[PDB]
Design a protein around this ligand. Structure first.
Ligand SMILES: Cc1cc2nc3c(=O)[nH]c(=O)nc-3n(C[C@H](O)[C@H](O)[C@H](O)COP(=O)(O)OP(=O)(O)OC[C@H]3O[C@@H](n4cnc5c(N)ncnc54)[C@H](O)[C@@H]3O)c2cc1C
Ligand SMILES: Cc1cc2nc3c(=O)[nH]c(=O)nc-3n(C[C@H](O)[C@H](O)[C@H](O)COP(=O)(O)OP(=O)(O)OC[C@H]3O[C@@H](n4cnc5c(N)ncnc54)[C@H](O)[C@@H]3O)c2cc1C
Ligand SMILES: N[C@@H](CCCC[NH3+])C(=O)O
Ligand SMILES: N[C@@H](CCCC[NH3+])C(=O)O
Lengths: 506, 506
């Protein structure tokens, strides 16, 4: 045919790298091939299901686990459709889930059940202690509703306040001082009830977008993948024309500007050079890109500074196997959902995929973020198997306190099988963190320099951090789609660019 | 004698716990004993020297390593005197140390050597790019000089602005908007040149106190301990009347309010109860205290919230052994100091304790904080020994770029012995972090509730975080001293309280 031989390089076989390869396989551009290199021995990146055994429900999702049916997520559910993903309902809110703060259980209708307000000798203002949801919907609500109208325009309006942290916004009452002003302890309590420890000190725009996703105006249903999110990776993996090359950690990316041809880019793997690429799509988390030698690409200094400085949140999960689902049978927690607490485990997630089992059951006993995750992570080994006895003992004791209304410590201990697994994303060298969670001013100042193609339009920084949808599959997918667009555009492949718009624009 | 038998419990054998025991041994209060329990098999906590071998200079300090001779540090140098510590000069600034940002070496007298300013197509304002030190001394200088006058009063005046982050202070120009206002990229560059990644998003008071310690107005000399900071632990350890009990991890602290006697406090260790304590001094980092069952102490909710929420900074060190000190012989870096860079290693510290050696030499190749430390930490194992090959390769490549003016990669590689060691404090279960580094408003709001004795004046939260001198030995020592004071006071031991003031108040 007409189009000259071209070869592109995809760095990373997570969902964004796999999506790029899937788009290319679909477009069937003549004489175009790709190599996809993955540092880990495992494919999927932050799509990661841990199977204790291959029994139907004997797993937990270490990375992505739940997906809300909202318009901005269409591209995700389209990917689920293309791959035949078996979806089931995910109960964000179930029933009878305990909530434990300051050693008091939540009680419906009671004033200050946790006894943390000034009226009971605490420091939380009485006007705040029981109206956290309402006060935050007043600080976020305008932006959240504009994000439902149209996410891109809603995002642009939110960028007018991006210089503020959530705590800053609440202390001053908006950019003009017109919204309510809150003291420290009121802001602290709103953070304690709404997110993870310290996270109101990150961007206000990120708190708004997380409220938009977890408490969307259209009260959506949630879904998960029966058999684990890694089924998606398997489906995508197997469709590929060129298989993932695992155990291939890219150490350098370069473009030879002394050579005028299309394929003048290289990557270095294990000290060996891989050359002849007309475009390199990097899909790693930014911490991994930060460690590569990128001198050969002549990046803009501020783009380089974004790679180093864009903030990543931590996250840790601990899953315990029990001989029967005691939370279902003894506590009446029959419909998924999650228990929240100021105890170290913070959040205990009841699986939505084993609701009708009666024997061995997995419990996502601890799901943490930020400093909470770093503290649990200090007791965790991501490769290995003393400090994880300490971890197990800690989780069991927190679990007994959290379910004290119906359960004793001895009974939870007796039901425990001795099988557990835990994971801390910051300790994963292939990610270096859990997911982007920008600081104040980062989305409006650093991000646009992150997203500009480099090496004369041949280098793309792709992935969840390269999107407005951090910590969601949708970000990875949009960013991947956008990079393919720029690639086609850059090489003036107008027939295939139109074909992309028809077959792949949602 | 008159005084009835009493027994106190010291949780943790770091420097604050060891100092408490040393004070008590000195006061020789009749019928008073103590137990000191340490979770680790090793004593010293964040005083931690790693000896590759027992040769005189073949070590690096994983925790504390350097001490500035300033008035607020007197108590530390007094402890050094009491224990016979061999001090030598520590060169904060040495000579010929390279600085590498945006792949350009620093050049004295050049305008924008790193080529990051707007005038060269960057984003750093031209009025900022080369005057970072001056602009920050204008934002900090007033407070730093008042801290030299008198640290306690200087600290109290700094608490009037404690609600602001450093970035907030710089974006608005002080609490009244009277100081200069800086845009994002100017603030970003000040952070890049002055501290670790993202740390201007923490408290402005903490940036001020770090500028006060590392750039004190009285331009002080710095010292380190010849043979490693762990010599201090050995000296303190050996003087104790009651030896540290290692491998004793406290899991719970309680007071039995149904029993009226002095010794009504207990701790739980390995599920066994240890009772009969008239006071418990907890000296652990707060993340460790957060994991204990403290229901038996009826803590104030806001005190509990401080334990969970006070922010900890991360820190990671990597030390490599070389067959000769090539930085001395080939690069003319003969007087210690440190090289700084935007490369992943961030800071390379040249030891001040092997300046005259010519054979095998240790290099502190990487010293990082915050998100920089988490990223290096993801390649590190704190107990164990693939990802640390990646770590070594990364450090060697960064070292070649940083010393490119006098060294090649192959030559640095050839000089490398294959012996290295690395450590990440956030991954240490016995600490859970590196050291306190408070967020906005935390020092002025959460801290005072941290410091109030609990359990009717019998429970003390002691350590560096329980002081105004975070991440310094002086904080631990002051906080320990203060807890002993309150203990004596609480039990009306007036003769021994005066004796404390005579023998131990600096
Ligand atoms: C704890 C957690 C929970 C989440 N929950 C949800 C959820 O409920 N719903 C949802 O929609 N999303 C969720 N997400 C987000 C989602 O999992 C991610 O956004 C997405 O999977 C990231 O895909 P990616 O391809 O952009 O990045 P990655 O998954 O990180 O892919 C990058 C790949 O590059 C590889 N790599 C790294 N360095 C190199 C190198 N030098 N050379 C070669 N390869 C390299 C990595 O091993 C990895 O496989 C969650 C994320 C986390 C961390
Ligand atoms: C990277 C780094 C560099 C530093 N550099 C310097 C420097 O140059 N100069 C300086 O002056 N200071 C420096 N410091 C600060 C100094 O090292 C610390 O402030 C000080 O050593 C802390 O002493 P501590 O007793 O308060 O806490 P710790 O050292 O943490 O002591 C607490 C002890 O309690 C133990 N413990 C934990 N949990 C339990 C439990 N459940 N039961 C029983 N025991 C338990 C821990 O194992 C530990 O031994 C540095 C700190 C770090 C992290
Ligand atoms: N998407 C992830 C993280 C969302 C919050 C990101 N700051 C989840 O469902 O938990
Ligand atoms: N005292 C430590 C840390 C100081 C900075 C604390 N935020 C050092 O000398 O490096």
């Amino acid at each position: 045919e007409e189009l000259p031989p071209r070869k592109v390089c995809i760095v990373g076989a997570g969902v964004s790298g796999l999506y790029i390869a899937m788009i290319l396989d679909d477009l069937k551009i003549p004489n175009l091939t790709y190599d996809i290199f993955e540092s880990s021995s495992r494919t999927g990146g932050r799509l990661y299901t841990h199977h204790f055994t291959d029994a139907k429900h004997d797993y937990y999702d270490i990375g992505a686990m739940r997906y809300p049916d909202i318009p901005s997520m269409k591209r995700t559910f389209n990917l689920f459709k293309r791959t035949g993903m078996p979806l089931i309902k995910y109960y964000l809110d179930g029933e009878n889930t305990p909530q434990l703060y300051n050693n008091h259980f939540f009680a419906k209708g009671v004033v200050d059940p946790y006894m943390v307000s000034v009226a009971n000798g605490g420091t939380v203002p009485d006007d705040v202690v029981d109206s956290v949801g309402e006060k935050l919907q007043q600080a976020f609500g305008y932006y959240k509703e504009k994000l439902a109208e149209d996410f891109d325009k809603g995002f642009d309006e939110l960028m007018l306040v991006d210089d503020m942290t959530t705590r800053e916004y609440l202390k001053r009452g908006g950019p003009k001082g017109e919204a309510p002003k809150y003291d420290f302890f009121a802001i602290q309590w709103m953070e304690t009830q709404n997110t993870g420890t310290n996270l109101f000190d990150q961007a206000f725009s990120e708190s708004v977008i997380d409220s938009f996703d977890f408490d969307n105006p259209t009260k959506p249903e949630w879904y998960c993948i029966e058999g684990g999110t890694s089924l998606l990776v398997d489906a995508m993996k197997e469709t590929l024309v060129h298989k993932v090359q695992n155990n291939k950690r890219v150490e350098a990316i370069s473009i030879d500007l002394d050579a005028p041809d299309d394929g003048n880019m290289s990557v270095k793997i294990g000290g060996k050079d891989y050359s002849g690429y007309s475009t390199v799509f990097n899909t790693t988390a930014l911490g991994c890109l930060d460690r590569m030698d990128l001198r050969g690409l002549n990046l803009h200094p501020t783009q380089a500074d974004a790679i180093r400085c864009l903030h990543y949140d931590n996250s840790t999960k601990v899953a315990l196997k029990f001989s029967y689902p005691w939370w279902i049978k003894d506590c009446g927690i029959t419909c998924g959902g999650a228990a929240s607490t100021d105890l170290p485990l913070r959040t205990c997630v009841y699986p939505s995929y084993n609701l009708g089992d009666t024997g061995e059951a997995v419990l996502l006993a601890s799901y943490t973020w930020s400093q909470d995750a770093t503290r649990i992570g200090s007791l965790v080994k991501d490769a290995p198997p003393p400090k994880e006895d300490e971890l197990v003992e800690l989780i069991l004791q927190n679990l007994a306190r959290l379910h004290a209304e119906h359960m004793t410590y001895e009974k939870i201990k007796e039901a425990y099988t001795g099988v557990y697994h835990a994971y801390c994303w910051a300790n994963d060298p292939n990610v270096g963190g859990a997911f982007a969670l920008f600081g104040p001013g980062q989305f409006s100042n650093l991000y646009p320099y992150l997203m500009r193609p480099a090496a004369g339009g041949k280098f793309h920084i792709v992935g969840e951090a390269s999107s407005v949808h951090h910590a969601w599959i949708i970000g990875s997918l949009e960013s991947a789609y956008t990079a393919v667009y720029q690639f086609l555009y850059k090489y003036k492949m107008w027939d295939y660019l139109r074909l992309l718009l028809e077959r792949w624009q949602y």
